[PDB]
C-alpha cells in the first residue's frame, strides 16, 4: 500500500533528522529545505484522504444505483407477470 | 466484489424469468411455476442484502479513512515538534 509506504518512509525521514539535531547538538539551510519537503509530502498525504472520501462516496453512490436498477427490474417483471 | 457477483447473477436470474414468461403466455407445469416464484423470492431477499451491504462497506471505508487521517496527524505532530527543536539550536 502506497499510502503506508509513504508514511512509513516519511516518519523514518523525521527521526533521522531528529538524529542528526541531537548529535549536533551534543556537538542548517539544508535542514529549512528538507522540512520544507516534508510540509510538501503531508499536505499530499492530506490530499490523497480527500481524494479517497471521494472515490469512495462514488463508489458507494455508484452500487446504489445498481441495486435500485434491479429494484426496477423486478417491478417490471412483477407487473409482467401479472 | 462478490457484490459485483450478486449483482451478475441476480441479473441473470431476471432475464430468465423474463425468457421463462415470452415462452409461456398462460401457465407452464405446476412444478415450472413454482420454481419462478422461488427465484423471484431469492431476487427479493438478495435486494435487501445489497442494500444491507452497502452500509457495512460505508461503515469500513469510514474507519479506514479515520485510520489514515490519524497516520498524518502523528506525522504532522512528529514534525512540528522537530521544527521547534530545530528553532531552538
Redesign the interface.
Known sequence: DP?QQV?KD??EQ?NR??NY?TR??TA?EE??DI?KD??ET?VD??RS?IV??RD?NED?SG??A??KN??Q??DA??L??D
Do not use: A, G, P, S
Open positions: 499510502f508514511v516519511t516518519k523525521l533528522i531528529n539535531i549536533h547538538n542548517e535542514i529549512q522540512l516534508v510540509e503531508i498525504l492530506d484522504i479517497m472520501k469512495e458507494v452500487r446504489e445498481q441495486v434491479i429494484k427490474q423486478l417483471l412483477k409482467r407477470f
